[PDB]
């Protein structure tokens, strides 16, 4: 009757206002990717419309999502970060 909480995918969603450079900034600053990998993920967001940035516990995923969204808000970009059950 008891199952562990599940893991969550943290996702970056595409939009037409947010600069590629800021998406890369976010991937490096909040997910620790190096420039190369961050750039690949930025392109994926651009083409697929969204991309998985990482998988974390529900608790950690929720916090990363809030942190990314606050940072986007602060810099006035509508960059949307979301989470989804893994």
């Amino acid at each position: 009757a008891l199952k562990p909480p599940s893991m969550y995918k943290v996702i970056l969603v595409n939009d037409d206002y947010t600069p590629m450079e800021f998406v890369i900034d976010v991937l490096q600053k909040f997910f620790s990717y190096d420039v190369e990998r961050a750039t690949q993920l930025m392109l994926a967001v651009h083409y697929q419309g969204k991309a998985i940035c990482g998988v974390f516990t529900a608790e950690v995923a929720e916090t990363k999502v809030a942190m990314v969204n606050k940072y986007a808000r602060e810099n006035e970009h509508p960059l949307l970060c979301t989470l989804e059950k893994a």
């Binding site: 008891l2 909480p5 620790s32 529900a58 929720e62 916090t63």
Partner: protein
């Protein structure tokens, strides 16, 4: 109004997370620190919890799932999860709701049950402990 023992527990748990370079201080770091907070420990012993086992389960989970800040990263440091923040606010709310002010480790433990998607709440229920078991211990001992 956190009592002295809880405050000490919270601050040392936080210092330990910072020494380990953990990006986040979780509700699991919190429950782990409460295992030796007198107030919360007494409640868990009253519920016949294998504290040695719970401790190991928490440490293993913390180690496998908590991101580690890189050496380079010297601009950001350990921060509490939203879940952790809610538990502390909830513990204060519950205590004030009864007209009191002193918040103990046991009240914090009670609040953990409300974070339904936390590994800590899951491990507590797995060790057959319910919110009401803890409230009963706080209200009536045994």
């Amino acid at each position: 109004m956190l009592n002295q023992e809880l405050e000490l527990s919270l601050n040392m748990a936080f210092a330990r997370a910072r020494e380990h370079r953990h990006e986040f201080m979780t509700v699991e770091h919190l429950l782990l620190a409460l295992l030796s907070n007198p107030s919360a420990r007494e409640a868990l012993e009253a519920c016949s919890v294998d504290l040695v086992a719970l401790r190991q389960e928490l440490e293993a989970f913390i180690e496998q799932t908590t991101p580690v800040l890189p050496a380079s990263e010297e601009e950001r440091d350990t921060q509490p999860t939203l879940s952790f923040q809610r538990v502390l606010q909830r513990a204060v709310f519950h205590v004030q709701s009864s007209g009191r002010n002193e918040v103990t480790g046991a009240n914090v433990l009670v609040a953990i049950f409300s974070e339904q998607e936390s590994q800590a709440a899951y491990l507590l229920r797995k060790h057959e402990v319910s919110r009401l078991d803890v409230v009963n211990f706080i209200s009536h001992g045994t």
